[PDB]
Amino acid sequence: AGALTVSLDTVDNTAQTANLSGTTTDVAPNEQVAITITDSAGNIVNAIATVGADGSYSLTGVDISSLVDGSLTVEASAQDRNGNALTDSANGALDATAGDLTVSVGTIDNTAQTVNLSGTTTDVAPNGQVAITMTDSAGNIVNATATVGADGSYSLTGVDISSLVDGDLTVEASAQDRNGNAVSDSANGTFDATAGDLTVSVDTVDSTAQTANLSGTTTDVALNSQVDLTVTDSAGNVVTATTTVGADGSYSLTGVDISSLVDGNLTVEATAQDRNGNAVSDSAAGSLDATTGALTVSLDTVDNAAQTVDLSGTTADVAPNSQVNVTITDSTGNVVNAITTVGADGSYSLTGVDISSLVDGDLTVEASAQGRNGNALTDSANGALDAT
Ligand SMILES: O=C(O)CN(CCN(CC(=O)O)CC(=O)O)CC(=O)O
Ligand SMILES: [Ca+2]
Ligand SMILES: [Ca+2]
Ligand SMILES: [Ca+2]
Ligand SMILES: [Ca+2]
Ligand SMILES: [Cl-]
Ligand SMILES: [Cl-]
Ligand code: NA
Structure with a gap:
């Protein structure tokens, strides 16, 4: 009965070569074994070997530099002396190229609230997907995806980051190389799409209780940020107060003790820090009349x-x-x-x-x-x- 075997004996990742051998039964010496080596992308290497006196065959230093990394399938074929088709296959792995990925921010467009991104890959298959994450100073996330091109490059234009808040933006990109290894890179930049602002208002001065109720609004001030307030009287005496900003940017403090201040005009100042590190301030007028002239x-x-x-x-x-x-x-x-x-x-x-x-x-x-x-x-x- 006619028989053929093939083995993939070595894959040399540095020389990008392979060594093959096999055996035959009932194949005539001086007949040929046709060989294909197929990679993970369907690229084919074609080779041929001669059957020896003892039915064996081998090839050394077969060039697989045309093939991409991942699985290799070796197919051998020959005919026995009576014409019967003989086949066998063998398998191995190629890892001639180190997988890598870069990502880089081209621009953060503060006016349109968009980002242009681009990057490079090594040993990532064209039509592969790059998973992109953009994370803001509050932990909000924008997800995006890009397709790896023939040269291994990828890019996105005008990705919408209007859902993110100002401050440091972290861009993370990841993909898989043809040997199944995660490749990743990150980049960072500043987002400043919103002008920081603060208002303060004197809701009430209770001259009987000698207290004040203060409130205000903020723009681009992070949740739980501290507001420092000062209340200044007509003699230069100062009372300090503090509170924190809410999710809607509002702040409120009721029952501020101003028993240490004298009658007349009050000036209230409020200061916080916006997401891009700026002090934002406002002042407001009030009046204290705890003692009847x-x-x-x-x-x-x-x-x-x-x-x-x-x-x-x-x-x-x-x-x-x-x-x-x-x-x-x-x-x-x-x-x-x-x-x-x-x-x-x-x-x-x-x-x-x-x-x-x-x-x-x-x-x-x-x-x-x-x-x-x-x-x-x-x-x-x-x-x-x-x-x-
Ligand atoms: O009340 C506001 O909305 C903001 N302030 C301006 C805030 N100032 C404060 C200051 O410089 O003392 C600018 C700032 O916060 O740096 C008044 C205005 O421009 O209408
Ligand atoms: Ca590889
Ligand atoms: Ca800002
Ligand atoms: Ca008075
Ligand atoms: Ca008199
Ligand atoms: Cl040969
Ligand atoms: Cl008076
Ligand atoms: Na008089």
Whole structure:
């Protein structure tokens, strides 16, 4: 019975050659064995060997540089002496080329929110797929796919990354080489499609509780980012507050303690950091009136012999070292004007004020000072001059 065997004895990955041998039964010496070596892409090497006196055959250094990596199938064929078709096959693996992949960002288009990518491969089959991942600073992901060309290159144009947020973008690309090995590369770049912004507003100043409610909005500020706030009063005193941004970019803080601040204008400033590392800020005006302005005046003494008066008074919500303006008007409209200073405790006095220019009869004392909320705070007192 006619028989043929073939074996693939060696594949030399460096020389890109193979050594084959086989045996025959009932094949005439000097007949030929036809050989094909087929690769993973269907490329064929054709070879021929002669059957020896002992029925054996071999080929050494067969050129397989035309073949691609992956499985090799060897097919041998011959005819026995009576013409019967004989066949056998053998198998091996070729790994003459190291698998590799590169990926590179051509552009991140901040205006269109798109990315152009390109890359190269080695030992990845044309029409192979490259799995592409783009990951943002928040862990959002865009998936994409590209087809490997004849030269092993791949590219994508205008991939939509409008679903990603600003900051570092990581691009990962992966494929499989013809020996079944994962090949991968990554690249990185900056995404800055959204202008960072922050607003702040004074919702309420509760002058009874001496608290403030503050809120605002942000653009391009990451979830849980810290907002630092300052509240500044009319004397330069500062209260600090802090809160965090929500998913919609809003922030709120209720019951901020401003008992340490004095009455008058407030300035609130808020600052956060956007996704591209910029400080974004806003300021807003408020008003504090925890203490009702007041002024009293008293005519303490009229010295009719020296023609003088002693005056005193009290204030509430008048900054110490403010001026108090005092007028003393007599019964015919003559006026004495004086000025003194509000003390640490809000009190003021004038002693030995000369009223020798006034005439006998009624005296009216008027005192005025500016409170911290900008009011003219006044009081009067009445007495008499009897110098003649
Ligand atoms: O209120 C806003 O929307 C933003 N701010 C501008 C924010 N400023 C703050 C500052 O410089 O003090 C610019 C910035 O945040 O750097 C006012 C405006 O431009 O309408
Ligand atoms: Ca290979
Ligand atoms: Ca940005
Ligand atoms: Ca006040
Ligand atoms: Ca008199
Ligand atoms: Cl031969
Ligand atoms: Cl006032
Ligand atoms: Na008078």
